Structures are given as C-alpha cells and as structure tokens.
Design a binder for this molecule. Sequence first.
Ligand SMILES: [Mg+2]
Ligand SMILES: [Mg+2]
Ligand SMILES: [Zn+2]
Ligand SMILES: [Zn+2]
Ligand SMILES: [Zn+2]
Ligand SMILES: [Zn+2]
Lengths: 162, 162
Amino acid sequence: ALTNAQILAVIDSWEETVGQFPVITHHVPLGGGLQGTLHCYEIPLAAPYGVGFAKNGPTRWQYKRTINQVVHRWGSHTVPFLLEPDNINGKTCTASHLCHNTRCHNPLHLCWESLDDNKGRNWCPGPNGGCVHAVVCLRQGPLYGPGATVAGPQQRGSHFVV
Amino acid sequence: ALTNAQILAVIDSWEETVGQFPVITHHVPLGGGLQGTLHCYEIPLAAPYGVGFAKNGPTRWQYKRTINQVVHRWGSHTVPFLLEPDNINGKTCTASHLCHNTRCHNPLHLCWESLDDNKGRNWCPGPNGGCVHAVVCLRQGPLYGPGATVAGPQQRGSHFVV
DNA sequence: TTGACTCTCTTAAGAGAGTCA
DNA sequence: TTGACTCTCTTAAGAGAGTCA
Ligand SMILES: [Mg+2]
Ligand SMILES: [Mg+2]
Ligand SMILES: [Zn+2]
Ligand SMILES: [Zn+2]
Ligand SMILES: [Zn+2]
Ligand SMILES: [Zn+2]
C-alpha cells in the first residue's frame, strides 16, 4: 500500500510465507566445468499455495493483501522490490530469476532489471565461465552453448560480401 | 508443389533484387575490444522496396512470386533457406540476423536456427570475445555487457539461504 | 501477376485484472 | 477477508494470410 511502513509489512509477510515453502536443492552448472548448489523455495504445484498466494497462470502467481479495507495485489515475484524504482531507462523493471526456476520465490535468487537483462541471463556462461553481469549470475544460463543452427550464411551467386 | 529447380529460381531472383539494395558499411564491435566492418544490404524504409517485396509490419517484409498462376509468399529473410530443413529438435527454424539489423537482407548476414538460438545471439560476446556458437557470430551482440540491474538479491529477515 | 496496404499469430522470458464462494 | 479459479496483456526476437485494382 501507499505508506513505507505498509510496504515493509507486505514484504515481511511475503518473506515469512515463502520462507515456509519447501526448500529444494538444485545442483547447477556454474561455467568453467564447475558445479554449485542452489536452495530454491518452491511454491506448491497446486492449491493451497500459501497465505496470500494464488495462481493466475501455469507458471504465474500473484500475492494479495487487504490494506485499508482495499485489496492490493502484485506479481508474486515483484514483492521484494516494492521500494525500488519500477522502471529503468524507460523500460519496465521485471523480477528476474537467477536460478531460472519459475516456482522459486527465494528473494536471494531474484533481481529487478529490464526484460532484456532478464532474458539475456538464459545464455550467460555463468559465474565461473565469464559472466559480466554487474549483479552476478548464480549459474550458467540453461541455453548457453553452441546452438543447433541448421544452415549458416550462404549465397548462390556473387552479389554479396560480408 | 514447386520443384527444387523452381525453388532455386526463386532464391536467384531474390538474390538479384536484394543485391541492388543500398549497401551500408557499419563499423561494429567484435568482442575483445576489437572493431570490424559489416556490409548490410538494407531494404528501403518505404515503398517501393524492390521487385517482389512488400511490408507486412513495421520491420516485417514478405517476398512474393507467382508461378504457374499460383501466388507463393515467404517471409523476406527466409528465402535463402528454402532448400533447408525447416525445423530442428522439434523447433521451427527462423531467419536469424548475425548483423542484428532487421532491414538487412544480405544472406551472408543470416543463419537459420531455432528462435532461442536466434535470440541468444543478442547477448553473445562476439567472435573475438568468446563466442561459442557453432555457426559463429559476426559481431558482439548489441545487448552484451554488465546490464543495468536496478536491485539485486536481498532479504529483510533471515528466512532464506542461497 | 504485381504492389501496397490490411489483419492476426508464435515464443518464452515477464505482467494486470475479474468472477465466484 | 481469504482462496481458487477465470481471462487477456507486454516485449522483442521471429511468422502466415486477405483485399483490391
Ligand atoms: Mg529470467
Ligand atoms: Mg536475431
Ligand atoms: Zn531459486
Ligand atoms: Zn551472467
Ligand atoms: Zn546485415
Ligand atoms: Zn556467438
């Protein structure tokens, strides 16, 4: 809600509820041939999810609280960042999973950044493979690698140069 | 169905037309602090675009040819790949700009790959900065770098471990 | 046969809001 | 007030198809 006190109360209630979500250990590539371990706090697969939480999409949830007799509702991963600017360079700030695990609500696995920055982590080589993200990745992106390109650049004639 | 000879004729007419597009020299980052040069063959900003070409969206075009009284139409960047498989690993193949310049139709600046592979090139460090794409990038991706993350991982209490 | 427009759709990283009990 | 559902939207890398002369 509007007051700083009320927003802190929202963040604190959220953390306490998510803190009781099952803690699931995931071993992850870090880049550089190394492996690490993340502890994700995973929202349940089906109702009930936890006080204040409801599913609005297969991998989408919202957190809701009643404040001043009014319902206030947020995307379930946005709550840690309610005191942060909601835009950057004219781009919307998004909740971004460093663990690349949608069900996880561990705020130690979340950052707040443009959708482009968010997406780009999918291909990051990782914290031991060359990550240059200023807010560092926790793991190599799941899509990092050589790709599976079917056909490369080519011409039949002689009209083009690189 | 069009014979492979008819398909080659389509590719050849496309190349002949695109080859006459304005050729624009662009200096680009390669990664590793190095700079290179790409020569993009850029479709005009407004009609007329070239024989066979029409705009279906702000940065979308199509190529159309009529053969034996049947109108055939393709996405304007897909024509170089008409003799290639159109999917891989159960994913549709997409035209992917190695120069990251949508108006460019130089086939030496295009490859044919999944949309995920395509997107990921936006963040690639580039051919002199650590690119691991098997079909190598021509330049560092425009979105490579430290990012502009507004807030990193954080908690107010002690409910969480990383 | 051709040009110049029109419309909606896909994907996978993210969102907001309404209907009932 | 709280829970459990429903629906459509945003973005930026890509698509197919219709109308008219
Ligand atoms: Mg993400
Ligand atoms: Mg691309
Ligand atoms: Zn996690
Ligand atoms: Zn990174
Ligand atoms: Zn180009
Ligand atoms: Zn690359």
